């Protein structure tokens, strides 16, 4: 537990061992960004400290980029909270 994320009551942990990464709510990805909202599903993901997501929810394939701490290409999505379902 060396870093928080948006995911309500998440079990993330920025440890030297745990290869978990963290990202901040992006602006380059807007429409798709709506998807990120699902990543939260909370009252209203306030960009104050919640404007960020952890890898634990993202798909391994979404980490194709070997950047410093910015891995969430157009593909990026918090699948784990994929609300998109047969309404
Ligand atoms: Zn998380």
The CA distance from 21 to 58, in Å, is: 10
Method: NMR
Ligand 1 centroid, distance to 87 Cα (angstroms): 26
Indicate the domain borders of the chain. 1-87
Ligand 1 centroid, distance to 74 Cα (angstroms): 19
Where do we find the tokens 């209203």? 44
Select from 22, 15, 17, 4 the least CA-distant residue to 78: 22
How far, CA to CA in Å, does 84 sit from each of 35, 44, 87? 9, 18, 8
Ligand 1 centroid, distance to 32 Cα (angstroms): 18
Ligand 1 centroid, distance to 81 Cα (angstroms): 11
Q: Contact 81/38 with Cβ under 8 angstroms?
A: yes
10 Å CB burial of residue 23 (0-12, 13-18, 19+) is: buried
Where do we find the tokens 């890898």? 55
């Amino acid at each position: 537990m060396v870093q928080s994320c948006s995911a309500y009551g998440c079990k993330n942990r920025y440890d030297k061992d745990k290869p978990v990464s963290f990202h901040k709510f992006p602006l380059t990805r807007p429409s798709l960004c709506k998807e990120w909202e699902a990543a939260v599903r909370r009252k209203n993901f306030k960009p104050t400290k919640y404007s960020s997501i952890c890898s634990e929810h993202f798909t391994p394939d979404c980490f194709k980029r070997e950047c410093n701490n910015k891995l969430l290409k157009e593909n990026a999505v918090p699948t784990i909270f994929l609300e998109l379902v047969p309404r």
